[PDB]
Ligand binder design. Structure first.
Ligand SMILES: NC(=O)c1ccc[n+]([C@@H]2O[C@H](COP(=O)([O-])OP(=O)(O)OC[C@H]3O[C@@H](n4cnc5c(N)ncnc54)[C@H](OP(=O)(O)O)[C@@H]3O)[C@@H](O)[C@H]2O)c1
Ligand SMILES: NC(=O)c1ccc[n+]([C@@H]2O[C@H](COP(=O)([O-])OP(=O)(O)OC[C@H]3O[C@@H](n4cnc5c(N)ncnc54)[C@H](OP(=O)(O)O)[C@@H]3O)[C@@H](O)[C@H]2O)c1
Ligand SMILES: NC(=O)c1ccc[n+]([C@@H]2O[C@H](COP(=O)([O-])OP(=O)(O)OC[C@H]3O[C@@H](n4cnc5c(N)ncnc54)[C@H](OP(=O)(O)O)[C@@H]3O)[C@@H](O)[C@H]2O)c1
Ligand SMILES: NC(=O)c1ccc[n+]([C@@H]2O[C@H](COP(=O)([O-])OP(=O)(O)OC[C@H]3O[C@@H](n4cnc5c(N)ncnc54)[C@H](OP(=O)(O)O)[C@@H]3O)[C@@H](O)[C@H]2O)c1
Ligand SMILES: CN(C)c1nc(N)nc2[nH]c(-c3ccccc3)c(-c3ccccc3)c12
Ligand SMILES: CN(C)c1nc(N)nc2[nH]c(-c3ccccc3)c(-c3ccccc3)c12
Ligand SMILES: CN(C)c1nc(N)nc2[nH]c(-c3ccccc3)c(-c3ccccc3)c12
Ligand SMILES: CN(C)c1nc(N)nc2[nH]c(-c3ccccc3)c(-c3ccccc3)c12
Lengths: 249, 250, 249, 249
């Protein structure tokens, strides 16, 4: 029987590439999404056309609130309901925008940035562990977490907290055979929202090829960590950044 | 005119040691507290006996909620109200208890552990900056053992990791405003009030430098250094005060 | 045409396992050794018996000296002489013994521990780059480098230097398309000879399975890093440590 | 009576500021130097004029060689000869120049850069410990050690090794009551001869004040670490960098 994975924020960009690559490796997948319903459904259709009954969708807002724990339990339950098992969890969903220290209320900014990047991953990890082979969790971290973008305090706080969870959960879940690791992009998939000077600016900074990573290149590191070639790896965060984090100001 | 400082969770233990040391150094202090009203007012009294109108208490819950930003703005406002200025913010208040992955609800555990150790610091830092020859700084109480977490303390550890991020992010963003943001990271310092002595000494024997926990004063000494003119170029630095504990393998 | 790899300290233990796995993967290999002449020649014999003309040995002392640069240049030259190309360098060879602060002279301890663990990797890197495809270098680091063993200051200084080399070379060699990464064991392959009681003491410290890594598990991470699935990864150090580095005192 | 301190490389710039500030705090000092004999002699004169026979000079090359251990033992011996005690060691002396991976020979660059930045500090640390209250060692590290300057591998390796020494020696010397810490400048006291327009290119990068640290600001962290206000501080590296290491590419 085929193992099953949950991928959060899987309708597009990097999460989509991760879902596709896991599916290509033999996994049945739960495609979690928030607003991108059309793309999520379209992906499930593509994957199921490829192998019957190997993809479902699960919608949820991963903003922090009093109902988040239940939402996270529901996402995990989705995988068990469809597939009878949940082997892999990939915490990819993430809000990202500036929150200057000096439009949304600040409390809403806290809820979204800290929720998606950290609390939800924790609650998902909890539900995943409680519901239990090669079991593992992969968290999408930031290679430049110690050289933060100006004015992105809350995002960066969420991403540091995710490092904490990766390490703490690796330690605590190791007794149950559940590995917990991170994959930490530098820049990958520059937005269409972004100008040509701005994109070029980022690309010129990347030592290895002066270009951003493709989504597939991020997904390759996820595949490695969930594989049997990573059986002794837990609590490790693998940068997939082309050397970007090594470049001083 | 004397500068003024806000210390969170300053009614007892390390926070009090910090408020006391700042006060001795010439600061006027806002003693924030949550449940320890008697301890806070008593400290405020001691300090005002030393110098009149140099201490005030300020009560606030720093659990995450949708009014936390208001609460944090009020704390800073209380320093301006009392003293006409606010030079130093120390983020010391902290909830600490296990939250196993496998009867406070989890919502409450998330709110208290992430609110006190990270979100309140952020919102206080926001309010401190917004409300502004001077020496403005923020000191965050971090964990020296943040990368070797205690078993079953994931939310507390997430909170402290987030506080590293805030220290770095805020150092970067507030530097152009003349506001320095640093950390002090104890290893083991004042042991929990309810801990016994088979266990207190088990923590003590782990510490390379002296086989003993740090005194509150020793933690405060590092805080006083970072707020001082002797640290005028230091920002985004987290100073470990751990007797080498973080260097010891399993 | 088959790519080629130099593995230092490859006659036994972890370097041998890395050489065996690269070879099983399709590489021709230079098996470098210092003293284990017999284990080394036996390994080339066996690999060549499996695929003709795919392994050679190369003897060099990697202690620091004024001749170390020529010795490192010759190692890389030996790979080109045998195979016509040099695609991969694995800096595995390492002296390891205590050097307390309070039979070998200190001169000799410095030369052996700092030479093998840091200066030879640097010179081999230089010769690798100067002599020049998915080109990459993998350095064998320590997962515990920031929680050092008591009385192992020079060994630890070496392994820290190795971290700096991994990062500096990743940055500098990126424009040439050469990736530089690290694999960081916690405990792996305990000396057959170390006492059993001491062995079980190390084993009981590892969160994931309460056992040391196999040599093959370490090699798996090397294989990942030199592969086409790691083409945007440079300057990354992957712990393969079962969470050991995460455990407080 | 008054404590005593060795400062390596103390004839000018940051080492000189450290020596002066220690002396002003009440220490007697050994002013170590290599080439700068006029400045070292002149400094000791100035300090002895303040307080009689509270300063001596000591010349030594700290390049790695077979005689480096005796050289370092003689530096510590010189403190004992002059003042009968040695309470503080400041490892400040450092060679700094590029060593590209692609007329000094490379073995000489290894010897100078690894010798001054790491091996001499180790040797001085050994001698200091052997010859033994508030005893401590302060090592001059880099805030930018994980974002290395392009083509400065050997220097960066040296500074990484020095982090490792700081930590290893803190652990090992703690039972002797000797604390071991570091001070990590970002950019400080730029060379007088560097054009001001090149100086401004570094300055512009520093978040706190768009300027470099004074030598005195660096010395202030050293004075803190050696003081009774840092009596529980060991194995800590304090960045004094105006936020520079936080700024991304
Ligand atoms: N791209 C990079 O260069 C880069 C760099 C560093 C780190 N990362 C990390 O790598 C991961 C993938 O990056 P990305 O650029 O692909 O991410 P992204 O496109 O910014 O976001 C991925 C998905 O997150 C989901 N999401 C956002 N807010 C949400 C909410 N409130 N509740 C539930 N889901 C929500 C969205 O779902 P819907 O679209 O369905 O609304 C979105 O598709 C992220 O964790 C990111 O932080 C990426
Ligand atoms: N002690 C150590 O060994 C150690 C180790 C590592 C890190 N640290 C860090 O150093 C700091 C001081 O340590 P400590 O042991 O002195 O701290 P503590 O005694 O555990 O807590 C300090 C104060 O935090 C306040 N607090 C707790 N929950 C709160 C809430 N919901 N809202 C507002 N305030 C709240 C309490 O105020 P009231 O009493 O008024 O309710 C308490 O007095 C903490 O940040 C801690 O994490 C300490
Ligand atoms: N085993 C672990 O738990 C562990 C933990 C952390 C890091 N690592 C790292 O992983 C790598 C492999 O570990 P290992 O246990 O397999 O190493 P090892 O058995 O201690 O050393 C491997 C080889 O190093 C070579 N070597 C030693 N001194 C040399 C010299 N002066 N010149 C040239 N070569 C020399 C030896 O070659 P000859 O036999 O031919 O003389 C030896 O076979 C090392 O870099 C090590 O530091 C291992
Ligand atoms: N300046 C910065 O921005 C910066 C940044 C990062 C780290 N640091 C560190 O802070 C410390 C002080 O920096 P700096 O800029 O003041 O250093 P520096 O001027 O480049 O060098 C300091 C002294 O090192 C001595 N030295 C050089 N080679 C030597 C050798 N082979 N043997 C013995 N002594 C030798 C020299 O002595 P003589 O003059 O007597 O020959 C020199 O005066 C250094 O360890 C440095 O790496 C500084
Ligand atoms: C949709 N995008 C742009 C992202 N989405 C999410 N959820 N997280 C992101 N993190 C980054 C980022 C963060 C720090 C340093 C570099 C890239 C990014 C980012 C920022 C710039 C260019 C490309 C990616 C990012
Ligand atoms: C009241 N106490 C005990 C604390 N309070 C707060 N708010 N934070 C704390 N953090 C720790 C701690 C964390 C990691 C490693 C060691 C101690 C502790 C801690 C835990 C055990 C022994 C001493 C201190 C701690
Ligand atoms: C042959 N051995 C014993 C080694 N050889 C080399 N070249 N390097 C080694 N590094 C380690 C090590 C170092 C720090 C923490 C754990 C293992 C070790 C090590 C030390 C103890 C048990 C297992 C491995 C080691
Ligand atoms: C005399 N100088 C220039 C130095 N001397 C020594 N012994 N070490 C030095 N380290 C640096 C440095 C290294 C990395 C990043 C920034 C500055 C420097 C440095 C490099 C550039 C500008 C100012 C200082 C430096």
């Amino acid at each position: 029987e085929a193992p099953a994975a949950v991928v959060t924020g899987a309708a597009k960009r990097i999460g989509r590439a991760i879902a596709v690559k896991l599916h290509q490796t033999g996994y049945r997948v739960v495609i979690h999404y928030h607003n991108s319903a059309e793309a999520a459904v379209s992906l499930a259709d593509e994957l199921n056309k490829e192998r019957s009954n190997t993809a479902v969708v699960c919608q949820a807002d991963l903003t922090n609130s009093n109902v988040l724990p239940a939402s996270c339990e529901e996402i995990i339950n989705s995988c068990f309901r469809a597939f009878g098992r949940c082997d892999v969890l990939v915490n990819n969903a993430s809000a990202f925008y500036p929150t200057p220290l000096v439009g949304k209320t600040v409390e809403t900014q806290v809820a979204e940035l800290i929720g998606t990047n950290a609390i939800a991953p924790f609650l998902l990890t909890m539900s995943f562990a409680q519901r239990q082979s090669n079991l593992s969790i992969v968290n999408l971290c930031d290679a430049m977490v110690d050289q933060p973008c100006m004015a992105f305090s809350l995002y960066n706080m969420g991403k540091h907290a995710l490092v904490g969870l990766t390490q703490s959960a690796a330690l605590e879940l190791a007794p149950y055979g559940i590995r917990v690791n991170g994959v930490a992009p530098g820049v990958s998939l520059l937005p269409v929202a972004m100008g040509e000077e701005e994109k070029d600016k980022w690309r010129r900074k990347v030592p290895l090829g002066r270009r951003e990573a493709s989504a597939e290149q991020i997904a390759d590191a996820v595949i490695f960590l969930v594989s049997g070639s990573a059986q002794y790896i837990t609590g490790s965060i693998i940068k997939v950044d082309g050397g970007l984090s090594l470049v001083h100001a």
